[PDB]
Every structure is written in structure tokens, then in C-alpha cells.
Enzyme design. Sequence first.
Site, PDB file in Angstrom:
ATOM      1  N   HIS A 180       0.870  -1.202   0.000  1.00 56.93           N
ATOM      2  CA  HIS A 180       0.000   0.000   0.000  1.00 56.93           C
ATOM      3  C   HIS A 180       0.887   1.225   0.000  1.00 56.93           C
ATOM      4  CE1 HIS A 180       1.147  -0.774   4.195  1.00 56.93           C
ATOM      5  NE2 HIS A 180       1.155   0.593   4.284  1.00 56.93           N
TER       6      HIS A 180
ATOM      7  N   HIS B 250       1.163   5.624   1.321  1.00 56.97           N
ATOM      8  CA  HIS B 250       0.816   6.810   2.097  1.00 56.97           C
ATOM      9  C   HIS B 250       1.100   8.016   1.229  1.00 56.97           C
ATOM     10  CE1 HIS B 250       0.640   4.314   5.853  1.00 56.97           C
ATOM     11  NE2 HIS B 250       1.542   3.598   5.179  1.00 56.97           N
TER      12      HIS B 250
ATOM     13  N   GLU C 201       6.024   8.981   5.199  1.00 53.09           N
ATOM     14  CA  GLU C 201       6.068   8.716   6.648  1.00 53.09           C
ATOM     15  C   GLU C 201       7.463   8.901   7.193  1.00 53.09           C
ATOM     16  OE1 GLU C 201       3.602   5.040   7.251  1.00 53.09           O
ATOM     17  OE2 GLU C 201       2.233   6.661   7.892  1.00 53.09           O
TER      18      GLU C 201
HETATM   19  C1  LIG Z   1      -3.208 -12.647   1.494  1.00 54.83           C
HETATM   20  O1  LIG Z   1      -4.034 -12.563   2.651  1.00 54.83           O
HETATM   21  C2  LIG Z   1      -4.201 -11.338   3.272  1.00 54.83           C
HETATM   22  C3  LIG Z   1      -3.612 -10.124   2.873  1.00 54.83           C
HETATM   23  C4  LIG Z   1      -3.917  -8.939   3.558  1.00 54.83           C
HETATM   24  C5  LIG Z   1      -4.794  -8.955   4.639  1.00 54.83           C
HETATM   25  N1  LIG Z   1      -5.115  -7.752   5.356  1.00 54.83           N
HETATM   26  C6  LIG Z   1      -6.105  -6.906   4.947  1.00 54.83           C
HETATM   27  O2  LIG Z   1      -6.430  -5.927   5.605  1.00 54.83           O
HETATM   28  C7  LIG Z   1      -6.786  -7.258   3.641  1.00 54.83           C
HETATM   29 CL1  LIG Z   1      -6.134  -6.238   2.394  1.00 54.83          CL
HETATM   30  C8  LIG Z   1      -4.590  -7.432   6.694  1.00 54.83           C
HETATM   31  C9  LIG Z   1      -3.370  -6.494   6.594  1.00 54.83           C
HETATM   32  O3  LIG Z   1      -2.681  -6.467   5.575  1.00 54.83           O
HETATM   33  N2  LIG Z   1      -3.183  -5.674   7.644  1.00 54.83           N
HETATM   34  C10 LIG Z   1      -2.114  -4.683   7.671  1.00 54.83           C
HETATM   35  C11 LIG Z   1      -1.568  -4.319   9.073  1.00 54.83           C
HETATM   36  C12 LIG Z   1      -0.437  -3.324   8.855  1.00 54.83           C
HETATM   37  C13 LIG Z   1      -0.559  -1.992   9.249  1.00 54.83           C
HETATM   38  C14 LIG Z   1       0.394  -1.044   8.885  1.00 54.83           C
HETATM   39  C15 LIG Z   1       1.485  -1.429   8.114  1.00 54.83           C
HETATM   40  S1  LIG Z   1       2.776  -0.281   7.734  1.00 54.83           S
HETATM   41  N3  LIG Z   1       2.078   1.107   7.381  1.00 54.83           N
HETATM   42  O4  LIG Z   1       3.486  -0.867   6.586  1.00 54.83           O
HETATM   43  O5  LIG Z   1       3.508  -0.086   8.961  1.00 54.83           O
HETATM   44  C16 LIG Z   1       1.615  -2.754   7.719  1.00 54.83           C
HETATM   45  C17 LIG Z   1       0.661  -3.680   8.093  1.00 54.83           C
HETATM   46  C18 LIG Z   1      -4.382  -8.664   7.532  1.00 54.83           C
HETATM   47  C19 LIG Z   1      -3.430  -9.674   7.364  1.00 54.83           C
HETATM   48  C20 LIG Z   1      -3.717 -10.842   8.214  1.00 54.83           C
HETATM   49  C21 LIG Z   1      -4.830 -10.667   8.968  1.00 54.83           C
HETATM   50  S2  LIG Z   1      -5.583  -9.114   8.698  1.00 54.83           S
HETATM   51  C22 LIG Z   1      -5.377 -10.150   5.038  1.00 54.83           C
HETATM   52  C23 LIG Z   1      -5.077 -11.319   4.364  1.00 54.83           C
HETATM   53 CL2  LIG Z   1      -5.774 -12.799   4.931  1.00 54.83          CL
HETATM   54 ZN    ZN Z   2       2.259   1.730   5.504  1.00 56.93          ZN
END
Ligand code: A1IWX
Ligand code: ZN
Length: 257
Positions: free
Chosen positions: A91, A93, A103
Site C-alpha cells: 500500500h 501513504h 512517513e
Molecule cells: C493474502 O491474505 C491477506 C492479505 C492482507 C490482509 N489484510 C487486509 O487488511 C486485507 Cl487487504 C490485513 C493487513 O494487511 N493488515 C495490515 C496491518 C499493517 C498496518 C500497517 C502497516 S505499515 N504502514 O506498513 O507499517 C503494515 C501492516 C491482515 C493480514 C492478516 C490478517 S488481517 C489479510 C489477508 Cl488474509
Molecule cells: Zn504503511
Amino acid sequence: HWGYGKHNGPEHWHKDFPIAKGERQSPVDIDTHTAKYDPSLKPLSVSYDQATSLRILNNGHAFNVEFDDSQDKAVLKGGPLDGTYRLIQFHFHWGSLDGQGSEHTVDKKKYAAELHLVHWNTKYGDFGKAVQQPDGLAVLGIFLKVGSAKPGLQKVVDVLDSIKTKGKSADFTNFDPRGLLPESLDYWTYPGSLTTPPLLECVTWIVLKEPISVSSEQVLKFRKLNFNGEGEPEELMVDNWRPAQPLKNRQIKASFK
Ligand SMILES: COc1ccc(N(C(=O)CCl)[C@H](C(=O)NCCc2ccc(S(N)(=O)=O)cc2)c2cccs2)cc1Cl
Ligand SMILES: [Zn+2]
């Protein structure tokens, strides 16, 4: 619930997530005259040739491009890392104006945006277990500056109309994340956190020195997304970044002289 507004933004997060004021929070300012070259850092290995993208989702904070992480298909190894980290999502920012959005900062410079390629340590078996460990995640951070278009970004830009509002998703198969990387893998690294709630202190940060260039048209399309759901008053998805946090008892190491 949390967001980036005056009433629910980063100065409020500590009330529900007290780790917001913790010892290893992200992002940070990278002071290039304090970061030390570490000749013991191994070369970074980015192996994305078998990456299987699935879907793109507007989550009300950003948009995520999700990958199949059920096998070792797209992995990050080497650098400061021990073991194998599987790509789960990327993703961005970004800002309302080209002078803010990143960030991390570099000598207090803010970039127009920041890409996060998120990976989890396969020794913990799944992402939910990995976020409970100090070495659970590795996030590769790439700065975006406005200039020439990034060809490998355009497939992402062109689907954003189809996920304008919170909760919308779209098929996003056969996307190659290699097209988002700069030429050089020179990097800075330090121990930190998720930059959004729940702010867990589970991340080895790897921030590339070389920014990628994207066009004014490409970033403008990011800024047409909405934080709100369909049939709610429009609030543009802009300025979804957390500012720099105190470095505390941490060293930033450079992979390069
Ligand atoms: C392939 O399977 C998937 C891929 C992603 C997801 N997820 C989703 O939210 C769906 Cl998009 C979440 C997810 O990506 N959450 C992100 C939490 C996070 C915040 C911040 C940052 S930062 N800004 O880089 O510090 C990194 C990560 C989750 C992953 C597992 C359970 S929930 C779900 C599946 Cl099962
Ligand atoms: Zn991030």
C-alpha cells in the site's frame, strides 16, 4: 474509530493504542550524517518473479494490493533479516500536496508519497502470529517523488476508479510488483513498528535510498480516492501518513558507504 482527521488522527491514537508512545515506534527521521555504514549487512534479496497478486481493496485508510502468501512465491531475504519473509500486501501513504505524504523523512525532507511492501516471517506460520513477535514483519519502504511516470504503477492507477470508497474491492490478478522498485537496493534499516493502529512493535524497517518517480497525473488519481463509504459525505483520501516519532535508543544502519 481511528483515522487521519483532527478528531481521530495520530495525536489521538495513544488513547486506544498506548504503544503509540512506546520505545520502537515508526516512522522516524533518517539523519544521513548519524546513520552508520554496517559492512556486516548482507545484500538484500527481493525475489518477486512468482508473485501472485489477488485483489485490491479500499480499507478506508489506504488501498491494499493483496498477494497469495500460502507458499514461498514472493519473498524478501538477506540484508538485516534472518530467514524468509513472505509478501502479503503493498500500500501507499500520500499527501494533499507534493511537499508532504511520506512517513519516513530523510534529513527532515518529506516525499510526495511512500510505498510499503509488507512481508511476514515464515517461522511464525501466519501473519496474525508474526505481528506478536519483535522480528515478525519486514516492511520495504520506497519513496515517491513527482516527475516522470512510473510505467509499473499505471495498472494500479487505472483500477482506482473501481474502488473509490471504503469497503470496495476489485480483482487484481497478474500484477508484477518488480515494476515498483528503483534501480538501486541501497537501504537504511532500523527496528520499529506498524505506522497505523495497532502500532505493534514487530517490524524490521528497510527503507530504500533511491526514490521512484511517478507523474503528477498518477498521484492526482491517488488523491481522488475517498476515506468514506458509498452514500456517505465525500472526504478525500489524502494525508494518510503518520509523522516522524522519537528515535529513542535506536541506531539506523546504512547498507552503503
Ligand atoms: C493474502 O491474505 C491477506 C492479505 C492482507 C490482509 N489484510 C487486509 O487488511 C486485507 Cl487487504 C490485513 C493487513 O494487511 N493488515 C495490515 C496491518 C499493517 C498496518 C500497517 C502497516 S505499515 N504502514 O506498513 O507499517 C503494515 C501492516 C491482515 C493480514 C492478516 C490478517 S488481517 C489479510 C489477508 Cl488474509
Ligand atoms: Zn504503511
